[PDB]
Nucleic acid binder design. Structure first.
Ligand SMILES: C[C@@H]1CCO[C@H]2Cn3cc(C(=O)NCc4ccc(F)cc4F)c(=O)c(O)c3C(=O)N12
Ligand SMILES: C[C@@H]1CCO[C@H]2Cn3cc(C(=O)NCc4ccc(F)cc4F)c(=O)c(O)c3C(=O)N12
Ligand SMILES: [Mg+2]
Ligand SMILES: [Mg+2]
Ligand SMILES: [Mg+2]
Ligand SMILES: [Mg+2]
Ligand SMILES: [N+]
Ligand SMILES: [N+]
Ligand SMILES: [Zn+2]
Ligand SMILES: [Zn+2]
Lengths: 184, 368, 368, 184
DNA sequence: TGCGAAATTCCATGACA
DNA sequence: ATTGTCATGGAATTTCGCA
DNA sequence: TGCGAAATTCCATGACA
DNA sequence: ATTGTCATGGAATTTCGCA
């Protein structure tokens, strides 16, 4: 069986609803399976149409052989099926209530939820502008399993933005009370 | 004056005036019988005025000016006095064309890595499409990989919006552009400083310098044109298709697509190359490093038979960028301060500001 | 189809498919093990479709199209099928650039006599001067003698007004112009027929053909510019001065002024040549006939290494004169009817009209 | 003494008043002394200013060494003197009431007065447009004294408009009554 | 029948949109 | 059915002045 | 160890205003 | 303080297939 490569499998998922930022509410999250490389896209809804619109941007740079997703309505619609078939992309769904990814992807998703949370405190509404820096952070984060960042694996070079500060990623006791304030 | 011309009349020899000819007075003027005819030798004190009158009839150069003078006069070393005036005629110097070519072009080394250097530039205005008129084109120096962004104006704000999206993927060491308003604004400089990106600017009015991206325009417009044949020019929806199409096109001299040079493996596009199917990613990346360094590099062409190359201290003139009708095509003479490379110089203009300038926008001031 | 590919599988030999290679079935497709890798041999009935899919990704030419196909397939003589498609892609044929130069320029004989041939052309719009915006420039072919008329528009009526004044002096056999509206109108044709003047037209969009007069523009504007330095561009009052100045200027290669070539003697202008003072007019005119025939004539330069010359029956394409944004730069292929000379041809367009056309506005249709 | 040449001497003179044609009333007449070549210029008046304006056109083609004229006010004004001095042209006047030209010039003037007269009958008001054809006729007229037309002597070639019909130039008995009508 | 320098000729370059 | 041209100003080559 | 033909490489040409 | 580039499609050259 052939070694795993970038573009073999894109894992896509929605995060949100979030506090509105520049009129956006959700993040479509795309993670390359082999590299751990992450792309993020703000959307106004977890619809097939917002999904197609975002993936059209991404697929003008790279087309995955397979897209893997849970059974979100956006992903199981017949429109989304047509879209994938047109591009020769095989669709693949995890069984309902049992999301399977890979360790790498699950841990990546984890980093994303945690990193977003850490940055949205104090500024729950300014996340739109932070999406670029989030991705750079995520893609220049050192992977313990391989010796390389997703950037290094995708492009085969060092990056000009190494995030040499491996971050706290935990919410300082201050911010824990700040977050427990926004829910009041 | 009349001093020199006196000794001449009484048959004594003065340096310059050959002895084998008969010099005489007639009609109150010193004359001489030269093979072509009888010419007046004016006094040295008169000569400059004569050359100037003759030159000024039509502001003619060496031979055409000489031929007028020679109709009535002879004196020793006439062309030397003609050339003196040509080098002092401000109108001739700033209006005439050069007849010396630039020295042969440099072929700067391909950037070593993807993201080492971006070349950026606008195309447009194009026919309105979804309210969009311009395309920001970003070309990665090493790979040729190109990104296309539709804009409404070639502005800083539109540039920043597009590059914020692109730099999501990676931040480049350098961004090279021409001197368009969008790229030279302090807002854009700030935007780059914030990200540790160095802004590099082309010498002004020399699109060769942005040649990596300029050349990509031609491929972009060409493919848009073919796709739009016999349809209305709805190009906005085609940018993504064109971007993808060009990034996955082979350059015959390199034998690779820009996508390949950036990722080392084709994505799921038609006719994907499969040669590294059995290699590990790591093996693949290692073969990619090797492919990247062994790419063809063009060499500096031979100089043309009559080129000039700049020298520190030389008088040279900058081309007027956008000359008005009936106005000179050249600025006043200025001095070469530093020769940055054989095709690029800093000049002191006469204002005097330091200006970094392409040799192609320069002529060597004629007649020293 | 599956016919040819069958004999191949059982180890028999078909022309084109070299025998020293192992051909087999796998995944329902005919394959082969070639040095570079394992490629699919599609049935002949499939090939055209494949070439077309590969070509159409970015409408690429020979090598770039081949390199896509070669990623997945092999069959005998692949480029031949690629080239077939390139020659049938209407979009490529009308959009791509030529990479063949025109054959070397003709240097037509100088007209034998003053007034044998006038070359005329407009300059402008210039900055308004006394309400005037254009200059009609008339150049006598043999002598270079030039007449300048200020106009308000580049119109027939203004052209007729000016030429009525000029032809007071002499009527020319021929008047050569480009295809500007002023010179192609039936009113202007009538005006010339009335006077026994033959109208000769340049091939369209080829100012080289009017080169005798075009070149004079540069001298005119150049002298206007110098005279106007640091003043407002009040050029109208200077036309007479410029006309006179240029007509009495020496051409260094000829060693004569156009005034001299027209009259055989200088008028009362500065630095008048006096060499024929002792000759009779008749002696003067006789020396002038001799000077006129012994003038320098340039020769056809060497062809560039990759030029084409037209051949009766050849498919060729006319350059679109003023192509809209994102629209093809070339018309559909047309056929060479007659080769008037090595740089000029009549073509049948596809409409089909006869059109007389410069080789410089033509490319030979690629891929036959 | 040196042989006679074109541009040695221009003989200038006014003809008119004439019937108004396109608002013009006079013709300034310029005849080259050596060649017999004629230039005509319509003016609104025999003033120095109309003279300078016309001669500026001519002198942008050829400058005469000498201008010869009678003692017309236009020609003897100090403005006209300045104009000539600026161009290095020597002015020369015939003595009052005794016009001296040369035979060639006098005969040329004669041809002009007669040719104009022949053409202005029936159309006394359309002479402006005829000035070009008048000059061509005049300059391609065979000279009995030399074997050549003024065109031939000026340019040293045959012309493309030979006036091979040596004209009547006399007024047919019809036109004599037509001219004796316009005076009524 | 030869030298150094001046004069003349050669011709690449660019520009007429 | 028509078609490049030629000022410019260093360099190359020739001619001049003198012996 | 050499032939005819195919494949590959060379590179002038023109175009990004 | 900076710097031309590269698709194209015939021609030239090299390599292949076979002996
Ligand atoms: C509206 C008519 C209809 C026909 O086409 C246009 C456009 N045109 C263009 C040029 C021009 O591009 N000159 C630059 C040039 C380029 C090369 C060369 F060898 C000589 C040169 F002078 C003219 O000179 C010109 O007269 C016209 C013109 O009259 N028209
Ligand atoms: C307003 C800014 C300020 C600076 O100048 C202008 C004008 N400009 C002109 C061209 C242009 O002439 N391209 C043709 C081209 C010519 C030769 C070559 F080798 C490559 C080539 F692409 C550009 O591409 C371009 O970007 C600009 C531009 O941005 N601006
Ligand atoms: Mg630009
Ligand atoms: Mg550009
Ligand atoms: Mg024209
Ligand atoms: Mg023109
Ligand atoms: N370099
Ligand atoms: N010819
Ligand atoms: Zn000058
Ligand atoms: Zn095509």
């Amino acid at each position: 069986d052939r070694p795993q490569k970038p573009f073999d499998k894109f894992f896509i998922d929605y995060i949100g609803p979030l506090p509105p930022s520049q009129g956006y509410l959700y993040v479509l999250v795309v993670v390359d399976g082999m590299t751990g490389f992450t792309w993020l896209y703000p959307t106004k809804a977890p619809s097939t149409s917002a999904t197609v619109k975002s993936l059209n941007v991404l697929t003008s740079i790279a087309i995955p052989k397979v897209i893997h997703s849970d059974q979100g309505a956006a992903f199981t619609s017949s429109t989304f099926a047509e879209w994938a078939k047109e591009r020769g992309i095989h669709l693949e769904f995890s069984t309902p209530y049992h999301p399977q990814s890979s360790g790498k992807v699950e841990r990546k998703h984890s980093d994303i939820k945690r990193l977003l949370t850490k940055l949205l405190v104090g500024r729950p509404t300014k996340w739109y502008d932070l999406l670029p820096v989030v991705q750079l952070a995520l893609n220049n984060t050192y992977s313990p399993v391989l010796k390389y960042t997703p950037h290094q694996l995708l492009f085969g070079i060092d990056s000009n933005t190494p995030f040499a500060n491996q971050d706290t990623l935990d919410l300082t006791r201050e911010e824990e009370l700040s977050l427990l304030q926004e829910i009041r | 004056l009349d001093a020199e011309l006196d000794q001449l009349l009484q048959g004594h020899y003065i340096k310059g005036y050959p002895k084998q000819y008969t010099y005489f007075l007639e009609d109150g003027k010193v004359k001489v019988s030269r093979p072509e005819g009888v010419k007046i030798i004016p006094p040295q004190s008169d000569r400059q005025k004569i050359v100037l009158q003759a030159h000024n009839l039509a502001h003619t150069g060496r031979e055409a000016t000489l031929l007028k003078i020679a109709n009535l006069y002879w004196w020793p070393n006439m062309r030397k006095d003609v050339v003196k005036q040509l080098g002092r005629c401000q109108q001739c110097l700033i209006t005439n064309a050069s007849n010396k070519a630039s020295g042969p072009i440099l072929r700067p080394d391909r950037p070593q890595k993807p993201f080492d250097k971006f070349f950026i530039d606008y195309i447009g205005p194009l026919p309105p499409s979804q309210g969009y008129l311009y395309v920001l084109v970003v070309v990665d120096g090493m790979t040729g990989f190109t990104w296309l962004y539709p804009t409404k104006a070639p502005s800083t704000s539109a540039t920043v919006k597009s590059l914020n999206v692109l730099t999501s993927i990676a931040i480049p060491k350098v961004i090279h552009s021409d001197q368009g308003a969008a790229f030279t604004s302090s807002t854009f400089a700030e935007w780059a400083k914030e990200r540790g990106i160095h802004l590099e600017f082309s010498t002004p009015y020399h699109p060769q310098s942005s040649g990596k991206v300029e050349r990509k325009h031609s491929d972009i417009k060409r493919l848009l044109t073919k796709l739009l044949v016999g349809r209305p020019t709805k190009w906005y929806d085609l940018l993504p298709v064109v971007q993808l199409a060009l990034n996955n096109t082979y350059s015959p001299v390199l034998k690779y697509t820009p996508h390949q040079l950036l990722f080392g493996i084709d994505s799921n596009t038609p006719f994907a190359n499969q040669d590294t199917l059995d290699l590990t990613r790591e093996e693949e990346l290692s073969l990619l490093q090797e492919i990247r360094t062994s790419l063809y590099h063009p060499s500096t062409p031979p100089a043309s038979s009559r080129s000039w190359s700049p020298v520190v201290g030389q008088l040279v003139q900058e081309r007027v960028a956008r000359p008005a009708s009936l106005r000179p095509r050249w600025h006043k003479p200025s001095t070469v301060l530093k020769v940055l490379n054989p095709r690029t110089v800093v000049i002191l203009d006469h204002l005097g500001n330091n200006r970094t300038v392409s040799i192609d926008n320069l002529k060597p001031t004629s007649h020293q």
